[PDB]
């Protein structure tokens, strides 16, 4: 079926939970043996969210190459994304090592450091120009260059230096700051505006490594971002845009990381975002 009328049909019939459970039943199951090794326990935030072995990002290190991160490679859309958990106190150096090694231009953050009165990720970037951060375990330096605070999101320019080679690179930090503590946003307008700002920066384009996108677990809000982006790109590329099937795209993405889209409300929100976005594109 088309999307917008399938949407009204699920709303009128109140069957979002049944649609979402079908997706959960049909989703891929692949091994995640490296994630579950005892030496990696303090490298995982949640025991039930792990990268599959076949798609995990490897750190270029011989001691321990493990990070909780996955490469989502969308062949028809010609887009790739790295989805990862919010960094932990003992993985902030690994996180920036990955950004460096994968040649990423942008980092997309969809959570606040504290939500619901608890810490959802480490404070992993510097807040003042004159107070830079040094990650001694991976030999990197990170400096805040500029910050632009808007009503729904903040963009930061960061300088990442590989202290071993003295090479430097500019990294863009795109921080969506207004996702509610509970539920999903009422309108997708600010989320779509944010997606378009990431696109306009070059951070999603083939002349760079894959964008790094995270929330707390790296599957819910993060899944919504890449699902909406890929569906909109396919609608622009194909002769028949009504042939794009959001459930099929989501199942394809779940071949590369488990659990993408965590609730039926997130699924409904993803439909809403793609529907509204397809009208603005033209
Ligand atoms: C000392 S520093 O500020 O230059 N770098 C420390 C990296 C780190 C950041 C946040 C939480 C844990 C560790
Ligand atoms: C404003 S500036 O002169 O300090 N900017 C230089 C460009 C640059 C930005 C961020 C990271 C690396 C390079």
Kindly give the distance from the C-alpha atom of residue 180 to the centroid of ligand 1, in angstroms, as a whole number. 27
Work out which ligand 2 atom sits closest to the CA atom of 171. 11
202 known member of a binding site: no
Name the token pair of 282: 């033209």
Per DSSP, what are the bridge partners of residue 172?
A: 106, 157
220 known member of a binding site: yes
Name the token pair of 98: 């990955």
Q: Cβ(86)–Cβ(216) under 8 Å?
A: yes
Q: From the CA of 143, which ligand is nearest? A: 2
Q: Alpha-carbon Rg of the chain, whole angstroms?
A: 19
CA dist., res. 15 & res. 167, Å (int): 53
CA angle 126, 132, 136 (to 5 degrees): 105
CA torsion 279→254→196→97, rounded to 10°? 180
Tell me which residue has its CA closest to atom 11 in ligand 1: 89
**Which is nearest to 77 in space by CA: 221, 253, 216?**
253
Domain range annotation of the chain: 1-282
Candidates 3.40.920.10, 3.40.50.740, 3.90.190.10, 3.10.590.10; correct CATH number of 1-282?
3.90.190.10
Residue 105's CB is within 10 A of a number of other CB atoms, namely: 20
Q: Cβ(252)–Cβ(74) under 8 Å?
A: yes
User: Is the Cβ atom of 143 under 6 angstroms away from ligand 2?
Assistant: no
CA distances from 84 to 45, 79, 137 (A): 11, 17, 20
Q: How far is C-alpha 111 from the chain's CA centre?
A: 11
User: Is the Cβ atom of 4 under 6 angstroms away from ligand 2?
Assistant: no
Entry resolution (Å): 1.6
Provide the CB-side half-sphere exposure for 185 (13 A, CA). 18
Q: Cβ(212)–Cβ(67) under 8 Å?
A: no
User: Is the Cβ atom of 159 under 6 angstroms away from ligand 2?
Assistant: yes
Q: Cβ(99)–Cβ(109) under 8 Å?
A: no
Residue 193 phi, psi dihedral angles, 5° rounding: -55, -40
Q: Cβ(11)–Cβ(19) under 8 Å?
A: no
Name the token pair of 88: 């932990």
Pocket test for ligand 1, best of 43, 93, 134 (most atoms within 8 A of CB): 134
Eight-state DSSP code of residue 209: B
For this PDB entry, the determination method is X-ray
Residue 183's CB is within 10 A of a number of other CB atoms, namely: 11
Q: Cβ(191)–Cβ(176) under 8 Å?
A: yes
């Amino acid at each position: 079926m088309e999307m917008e009328k399938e949407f009204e049909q699920i709303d009128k019939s109140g069957s979002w939970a049944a649609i979402y459970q079908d997706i959960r039943h049909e989703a891929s199951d692949f091994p995640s043996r490296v994630a579950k090794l005892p030496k990696n326990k303090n490298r995982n935030r949640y025991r039930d969210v792990s990268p599959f072995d076949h798609s995990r990002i490897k750190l270029h290190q011989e001691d321990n190459d493990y990070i909780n991160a996955s490469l989502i490679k969308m062949e028809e859309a010609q887009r790739s994304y790295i989805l990862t958990q919010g960094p932990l106190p003992n993985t902030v150096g690994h996180f920036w090592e990955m950004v460096w090694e994968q040649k990423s231009r942008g980092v997309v953050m969809l959570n606040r450091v504290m939500e619901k009165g608890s810490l959802k990720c480490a404070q992993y970037w510097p807040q003042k120009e004159e107070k830079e951060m040094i990650f001694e375990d991976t030999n990197l330096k990170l400096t805040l260059i500029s910050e632009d605070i808007k009503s729904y999101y903040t963009v930061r320019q960061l300088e990442l230096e590989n202290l071993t080679t003295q090479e430097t690179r500019e990294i863009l930090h795109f921080h969506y700051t207004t996702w509610p503590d509970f539920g999903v946003p009422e309108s997708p307008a600010s989320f779509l505006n944010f997606l378009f700002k990431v696109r306009e920066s070059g951070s999603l384009s083939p002349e760079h490594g894959p964008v790094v996108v995270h929330c707390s677990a790296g599957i819910g809000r993060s899944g919504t971002f890449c699902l909406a982006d890929t569906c909109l790109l396919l609608m622009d590329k194909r002769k028949d845009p009504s042939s794009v099937d959001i459930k099929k795209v989501l199942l394809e993405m779940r071949k590369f990381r488990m659990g993408l889209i965590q609730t039926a409300d997130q699924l409904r929100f993803s439909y809403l975002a793609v529907i509204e976005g397809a009208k603005f594109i033209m």
